[PDB]
């Protein structure tokens, strides 16, 4: 059967918030069956722990959020996105702040932690979430789409029209049949035009950022001086986004996303408008790892 994963060790990193510019220590522990991805602020008198669920996302505008009353853990999703990525049913995640550090801005360096504490299998069946029914949710011209799939495929549309994207690509699907998330979406850095960043650190707002951890674009140039890491790295950071913010479904998907313009928001809404709905999705498991569609 396919069977549940969780870390072989325990291993550790330290970085800064991208929002808060906070120093933070990060722990990665293994976790028994069925727990999921939980959250701890461990720097908290008592200690909070916040499940990694749909339910528990809080503000989405900028980066997503869980929240447990009055304590927050920002900037979820690049972490979830290598955990999802890998395969990681079960860990415990440990915080010295309420923001996961934001290392080089893609999911490398959290696919490097996973891969260097080591994979353990555990003794019960993975369970999948398979998409039965096209579900979807909007916002203006924004959209995001499960829809049924066999296999695990995530497709991306971006559509800006500022003279630095024309004659980029703006799209791509990814069926991870023949597609290695770590080798060709999981490098993919977060980016930001130069007059947003402005605003925010008007604010004192992404007090973390800086030209290691972000790809800078303005109306016409990439500014970072090495250029782009993959010929598509704007859209694939989109993918690696949704990657995450599906994985607060607490299992993988058997089943194809497909996200137009859209973000953080509207990635939870449609878990959400998933979730409500029995009809649309069903819980699977493999006691034959052949007869699968996808493969860990
Ligand atoms: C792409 C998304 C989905 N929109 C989103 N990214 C952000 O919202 C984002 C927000 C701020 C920054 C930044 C910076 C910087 C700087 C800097 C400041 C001063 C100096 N002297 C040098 C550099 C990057 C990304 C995301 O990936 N969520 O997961
Ligand atoms: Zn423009
Ligand atoms: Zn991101």
């Known amino acids: 059967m396919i069977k549940q994963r969780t870390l072989k060790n325990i291993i550790r990193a330290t970085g800064v918030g991208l929002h808060s510019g906070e120093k933070v220590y990060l ?3 293994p976790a028994p069956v069925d727990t999921g991805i939980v959250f701890s602020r461990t720097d908290l008198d008592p200690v909070v722990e916040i499940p990694a ?3 528990n996302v809080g503000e989405t505008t ?3 959020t869980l929240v447990k009353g009055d304590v927050k853990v920002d900037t979820v999703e690049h972490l979830l996105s290598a955990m999802a990525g890998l395969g990681i049913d079960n860990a415990y995640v440990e915080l010295s702040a309420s923001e996961v550090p934001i290392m080089d801005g893609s999911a490398g360096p959290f696919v490097f932690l996973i891969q260097s504490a080591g994979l353990q299998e555990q003794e019960a069946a993975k369970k999948f979430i398979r998409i039965k029914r096209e579900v979807s949710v909007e916002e203006g011209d924004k959209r995001a ?7 695990f495929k995530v497709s991306f549309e971006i559509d800006f029209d500022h003279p630095v994207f024309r004659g980029r690509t703006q799209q791509a699907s990814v069926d991870f ?5 770590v080798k060709e979406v999981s490098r993919a850095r977060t980016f930001g035009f130069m007059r947003d960043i402005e605003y925010l650190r008007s604010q004192n707002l992404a007090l973390g950022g800086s030209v290691e951890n972000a790809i800078v674009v303005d109306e016409n140039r990439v500014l970072n001086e090495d250029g782009l890491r993959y010929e598509d790295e704007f859209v694939k950071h989109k993918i690696l986004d949704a990657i ?14 497909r996200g137009f313009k859209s973000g953080h928001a509207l ?4 878990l959400r408008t998933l979730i409500a709905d ?3 999705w069903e819980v699977v498991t493999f006691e034959d790892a052949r007869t699968a569609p996808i493969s860990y």
């Open 278 to 280: 029995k009809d649309a």
């Open 27 to 29: 722990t990665l522990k």
């Open 62 to 64: 900028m980066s997503t």
């Open 145 to 151: 789409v499960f829809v049924p799939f066999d296999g």
């Open 53 to 55: 669920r749909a339910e």
């Open 244 to 257: 995450g913010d599906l994985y607060l479904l607490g299992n993988s998907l058997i089943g194809e996303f």
């Open 177 to 181: 049949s023949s597609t290695s998330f």
């Open 267 to 270: 990635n939870n809404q449609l």
